[PDB]
C-alpha cells in the first residue's frame, strides 16, 4: 500500500505545516502537525478541558463506531519548545492520504498547554520519530508509520515541505518526479529515538565549504534550523546589523537586509537553503527588526534540522531494518 497527503503551511511564515488525517468511523478529519521529532499521535478531543479549546477541530470518540478505549492507558508529553499535553487513549482507524491503519493509538487530550490552545490551526500532532519515544503508559504504543510499515510497498516515508507553499508527505514510495539529481543517503542513529544523522559541514552564501561533522536530528515539527553557536555566528556575521538579542531570544537582523544562503552537507552532496527561507519576519507587528531562521542550539543539547533546512530538500525517512535518511535537491 501507499499514501500521499498534501501538507500546508499554517501561516505566511511557514511556522508549521498541517496535514489532514481521517480518524474513526465515519471519518473525522483533523489537521495534524506531522512531527518526525516525536512519537505520539494526539488530538484535541471532546475530552479536552473546554477553556483550552479555541477553534480547533476535535475528535469525538463516542461518535466513532470503531473507537475503543485503551483501558488504563494515559499519556503526557513535553516538547522542546516548552509546550505540553496529556490525556487518555483510544484505538481507532486512522488514514493518511489513502493509507489506512486499524487499531492505531489515538491519544485524546484532556489538557493542553497555552501555546496549543492559542494555535487554532493545529488539531494535534502525528509523531513520526521512533516508537521508543512514545509516552503512553503503562503499555507504550506504536507510531502510525510503525503500524503501517509492513503493509507499505517500501518501508519509507518522504517529506517534501514547501516554502510559502503546500508540499507533500508520501508513505510507501519515493516519487522520482519530486526532486532533481540523486538522493544521497546517510546513516541514522536511533539511540535517542530520533532520526539522528551527521551533516558533513556547511557554507555561508558563496563562501567556501567548511568540512565539519554536525550531529543533529531531522525534525519536521521544529520550525527553525538550530546549529552550534560557532556555525550560527559565522552565518549572521555576513548580515550587516545582525545581532543576538537575549531579550528577543535569538538572532535578529534588519528587515531591510538581503540574507545569504546557507548550505549543509549530506555526505559529498550539498543542500542549499536560499536566504529568503531564513527570514521569519518582524519580531513584533510593525517592527523593522526581523527574526532569524538559523539559531543557536547551545543549551538545547542537540542540533535540529527543522523546517528551514528540510523544506530546501526532498527528504526520505527510510525505515528499513537499519534506518537511513536521504536528501535530494528539488
Swiss-Prot record:
Active site as annotated: 35, 199
The protein's Enzyme Commission number: 3.4.23.22
Disulfide links within the chain: 255-290
Catalytic activity of the protein: Hydrolysis of proteins with specificity similar to that of pepsin A, prefers hydrophobic residues at P1 and P1', but does not cleave 14-Ala-|-Leu-15 in the B chain of insulin or Z-Glu-Tyr. Clots milk
One record GO biological process: proteolysis
Portion of the full sequence shown: 90 to 419 of 419
Keyword Hydrolase assigned: yes
The entry's keywords: Aspartyl protease, Disulfide bond, Hydrolase, Protease, Signal, Zymogen
Domain Peptidase A1: start-end pairs: 17-328
One example GO MF annotation: aspartic-type endopeptidase activity
Protein's recorded name: Endothiapepsin
Keyword DNA-binding recorded: no
